[PDB]
């Protein structure tokens, strides 16, 4: 099948992103202050830890934005906070003609928003619908929601900005893996889970325009609302490791794809790289052995279900079922095909686990 995956960073490009983030750290933390472990609580004038503020400044700087806020609830929390700062309950939100991310749909339902739908793959239709229906804001997913999605993030954002429609991007599984996240190419705010970036459980980030971020910070009254200094430092730690380790993974996925396409595993009928929704391999077998292969692969070290995904815990490759939306659209595929996210493994390991599992069914 045909896909249009996001463009991965090379190892050289990834190093440059790593270095640029560390440069921002240096410019916001005197060295002795970086070794302070992270402060706690509702410090006067900030209503958050001093170190958390600093980390937020670093995040804003690193992603070419005015401001940032760390929030509870990871990626879902970030999207909720961002949407709540862009529109009111009962207002109109523009979304792409494809399945809305499940917890995002929950947020939409809990806010009583009216959805306006258009195919983002058709910029002409996008522009017409925006002019006619006058949405109060737009949400754009960075990763691919369905195989046929081929739109360029920056171009969709540019269209929205020209029409004066505030835009939020859901950048999960794209951050530190592509050249520009939403707030770097036209969005009013980007959002992402830090848990999916080798960071701490429960922590999400909203990064973008100060007026939006300030509205978010104003709602974070309570002690529990805050991200503690140590958690904030862990976000930076994870983010510094993210680009290079993912560039290594992107290389593994490309080499694995080439080997499979070259016939390394005769029992494989087809293989493709796809954003599903993170960039992974989709491997289809000639015979309906997918479930058996998944069972055998787990015994040989493959992760059988995700955590983050792409969290600090997820080191061995993930061999997993197909996504819900894809299975709905293609009811027979689940018997024949699987997703593989190599995580920190190499292609020879994935190939070996694949071959040994097939031999053992």
Residues in the chain: 361
Helix (H, G, I), strand (E, B) or coil at 256: helix
Give me the residues paired with residue 282 across strands. Answer: 272, 339
> In the bound complex, what is the minimum distance in angstroms from residue 357's beta carbon to Ni ion?
16
The residue among 285 and 320 lying less far from Ni ion, judged by its C-beta, is 285
**Phi-psi region at 9: left, alpha or beta (left = phi > 0; alpha = psi -120 to 50):** beta
Residue with tokens 């640029």: 20
> In the bound complex, what is the minimum distance in angstroms from residue 289's beta carbon to Ni ion?
8
The residue among 223 and 288 lying less far from Ni ion, judged by its C-beta, is 288
By CB under 5 A, is residue 338 in contact with Ni ion? no
C-alpha dihedral sign at 18, 22, 23, 28: positive
By CB under 5 A, is residue 239 in contact with Ni ion? no
The residue among 37 and 288 lying less far from Ni ion, judged by its C-beta, is 288
Q: How many residues bind Ni ion (CB under 5 A)?
A: 2
What is the distance between the terminal CA atoms of the chain, rounded to a whole angstrom?
A: 26
> In the bound complex, what is the minimum distance in angstroms from residue 66's beta carbon to Ni ion?
51
Three-state SS annotation for 88-136: CCCCEEEEECCCCCHHHHHHHHHHCCEEEEECCCCHHHHHHHHHHHCCC
Of residues 158, 204, 273, 171, the one with CA closest to residue 56 = 204
The residue among 302 and 336 lying less far from Ni ion, judged by its C-beta, is 336
Using the rule CB under 5 A, give the single segment among 49-57, 105-113, 283-291, 351-359 that binds Ni ion: 283-291
By CB under 5 A, is residue 336 in contact with Ni ion? yes
> In the bound complex, what is the minimum distance in angstroms from residue 287's beta carbon to Ni ion?
6
* Contact call for residues 166 and 151 (beta carbons, < 8 A): no
Structure tokens at 6: 């996001």
The residue among 288 and 304 lying less far from Ni ion, judged by its C-beta, is 288
Residue nearest Ni ion by beta-carbon distance: 336
| Of 90, 288, 304, 324, the one binding Ni ion by CB under 5 A | 288
> In the bound complex, what is the minimum distance in angstroms from residue 335's beta carbon to Ni ion?
6
Query: What is the footprint of Ni ion within residues 65-104 (CB under 5 A)?
Result: none
The pattern of x and - marking residues 24 through 63 that bind Ni ion according to CB under 5 A reads ----------------------------------------
> In the bound complex, what is the minimum distance in angstroms from residue 256's beta carbon to Ni ion?
20
- Taking the C-alpha atoms of residue 243 and residue 245, their distance in angstroms, rounded to an integer, is 6
Residue 205: what are its φ and ψ, rounded to 5°? Answer: -130, 140
Using the rule CB under 5 A, give the single segment among 50-58, 108-116, 280-288, 310-318 that binds Ni ion: 280-288
Q: Which residues bind Ni ion (CB under 5 A)?
A: 288, 336
């Amino acid at each position: 099948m045909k896909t249009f995956p996001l463009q991965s960073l090379t190892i050289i490009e990834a190093q440059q992103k790593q270095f640029a983030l560390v440069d921002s750290i240096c410019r916001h933390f005197p060295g002795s202050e970086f070794l302070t472990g992270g402060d706690l609580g509702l410090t006067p004038g900030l209503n958050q830890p001093r170190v958390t503020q600093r980390v937020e400044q670093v995040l804003a700087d690193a992603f070419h934005a005015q401001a940032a806020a760390l929030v509870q609830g990871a990626g879902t929390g970030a999207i909720r906070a961002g949407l709540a700062a862009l529109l009111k309950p009962g207002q109109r939100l523009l979304v792409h003609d494809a399945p809305v991310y499940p917890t995002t749909r929950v947020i939409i339902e809990q806010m009583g928003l009216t959805l306006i739908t258009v195919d983002f793959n058709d910029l002409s239709a996008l522009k017409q619908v925006v002019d006619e229906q006058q949405p109060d804001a737009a949400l754009v997913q960075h990763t691919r929601q369905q195989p046929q999605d081929s739109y360029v993030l920056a171009d969709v954002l540019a269209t929205l900005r020209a029409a004066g429609v505030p835009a939020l991007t859901d950048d999960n599984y794209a951050v530190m893996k592509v050249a520009r996240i939403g707030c770097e190419c036209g969005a009013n705010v980007s959002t992402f889970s830090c848990f999916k970036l080798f960071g701490p459980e429960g922590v999400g980030a909203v990064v973008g325009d100060a007026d939006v971020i300030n509205r978010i910070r104003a709602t974070l009254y309570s002690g529990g609302s805050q991200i503690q200094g140590a958690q904030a430092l862990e976000v930076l730690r994870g983010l510094v490791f993210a680009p290079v380790m993912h560039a290594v993974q992107a290389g593994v996925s490309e080499r694995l794809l080439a080997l499979l396409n070259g016939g390394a595993v005769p029992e494989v009928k087809s293989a493709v790289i796809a954003n599903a929704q993170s960039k992974v391999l989709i491997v289809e077998f000639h015979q309906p052995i997918a479930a058996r292969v998944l069972e055998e692969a787990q015994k040989r070290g493959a992760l059988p279900y995700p955590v983050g995904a792409e969290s600090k815990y997820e080191i061995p490759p993930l061999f997993y079922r197909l996504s819900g939306t894809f299975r709905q659209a293609n009811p027979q595929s689940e018997h024949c095909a699987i997703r593989i996210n190599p995580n920190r493994s190499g292609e020879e390991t994935v190939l070996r686990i694949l071959r040994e599992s097939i031999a053992s069914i």
